């Protein structure tokens, strides 16, 4: 159980475009000794689902094996089961909703036999959150305390409910399986009540797969798509949500979008803003934009240039002693500066403040 001396801030990104979608993503190790986050991003799906897309963030615990496996294989376990292909024509809401349940339980069990057969030593587990997007529906999927949300019409239209042990239904299940919730943890150890893997928590004799201490059962929500009102979707692991709320991040992402159409950069900003707000976990963000996502605005760009220039002068004028960056940040915060990005605050502006500090105090 360890942190690094200094955070690994190297971004891993991806992007793509298709089916009237644009997407960006950013993943960062941060203060943690390991990177155990994984993700999927694919526009255009096999077997006659060309117009479908799928995205997901996977937050691994006690190693990355479960996450990494899910990130390569969860999609086919979901679409290649009889429940997903039940009816004859294109799959229905129930086909999709059940297909995901079956796909989740079947990959979990599949990993359990692989781990048994090969004598595997890892005792890892993983959250999953994502959307499966059809020409007319966004199907949110959640299993764990990773979280996604839909921004529609400038507002938080929907978000996923984190599976926490102390949530009433999860508490009920955990107790009926002969465990308890201590403070916020399953038997005082595990911070999530749902996850793939974690097989040591799925050994309760004579209880179903979905009635163990930790369930792999997903929660699925069908939201009907809205060409006119749908703006963007954020998926991210708990490393983000720990330090930003739904509305905030939603307002922040908007404010960034009005400045770039570069989505990897928007995801970098979210991730950095969070590290600077105190987050010490691995972080991974996916941003998927619909055609009526916020547009780059000339005025917004100008306002950011003006703010940036202002922040640069404030840094120099403060330097006059020679205070360190931590102290300059302190002074700047005490100045109560207007027009900082919404949700992001001073933290979302540290990269500008620090490059300036470095220009003026390089040694
Ligand atoms: Mn993790
Ligand atoms: Mn995490």
Curated annotation (Swiss-Prot):
Gene transcribed to yield this protein: PPM1A
Entry binding sites for Mn(2+) 2: 59, 238, 281
Membrane topology summary: Lipid-anchor
One GO process term, biological-process aspect: negative regulation of canonical NF-kappaB signal transduction
Presence of keyword Cytoplasm: yes
Catalytic activity: O-phospho-L-seryl-[protein] + H2O = L-seryl-[protein] + phosphate; O-phospho-L-threonyl-[protein] + H2O = L-threonyl-[protein] + phosphate
Binding site for Mn(2+) 1: 59-60
Subunit structure: Monomer. Interacts with SMAD2; the interaction dephosphorylates SMAD2 in its C-terminal SXS motif resulting in disruption of the SMAD2/SMAD4 complex, SMAD2 nuclear export and termination of the TGF-beta-mediated signaling. Interacts with SMAD2; the interaction dephosphorylates SMAD2 in its C-terminal SXS motif resulting in disruption of the SMAD2/SMAD4 complex, SMAD2 nuclear export and termination of the TGF-beta-mediated signaling. Interacts with the phosphorylated form of IKBKB/IKKB.
Organism the protein comes from: Homo sapiens
Any one cellular-component term (Gene Ontology): cytosol
Cofactor-binding details, from the entry: Binds 2 magnesium or manganese ions per subunit.
Entry's family note: Belongs to the PP2C family.
Top EC group: hydrolase
N-myristoyl glycine lipid modification positions: 1
Residue ranges of domain PPM-type phosphatase in the record: 22-290
EC number(s) from the headed UniProt entry: 3.1.3.16
Subcellular localization: Nucleus; Cytoplasm, Cytosol; Membrane
Cofactor(s) needed by this chain: Mg(2+); Mn(2+)
Known function: Enzyme with a broad specificity. Negatively regulates TGF-beta signaling through dephosphorylating SMAD2 and SMAD3, resulting in their dissociation from SMAD4, nuclear export of the SMADs and termination of the TGF-beta-mediated signaling. Dephosphorylates PRKAA1 and PRKAA2. Plays an important role in the termination of TNF-alpha-mediated NF-kappa-B activation through dephosphorylating and inactivating IKBKB/IKKB.
Keyword entries, A-Z: Cytoplasm, Hydrolase, Lipoprotein, Magnesium, Manganese, Membrane, Metal-binding, Myristate, Nucleus, Phosphoprotein, Protein phosphatase
GO molecular function: calmodulin-dependent protein phosphatase activity; magnesium ion binding; manganese ion binding; protein serine/threonine phosphatase activity; R-SMAD binding
UniProt xrefs under InterPro entries: PP2C, PP2C_BS, PP2C_C, PP2C_C_sf, PPM-type-like_dom_sf, PPM-type_phosphatase-like_dom
Entry-linked SUPFAM superfamilies: PP2C-like, Protein serine/threonine phosphatase 2C, C-terminal domain
Modification comment: N-myristoylation is essential for the recognition of its substrates for dephosphorylation.
Protein name, entry field: Protein phosphatase 1A
Protein transport found in the keyword field: no
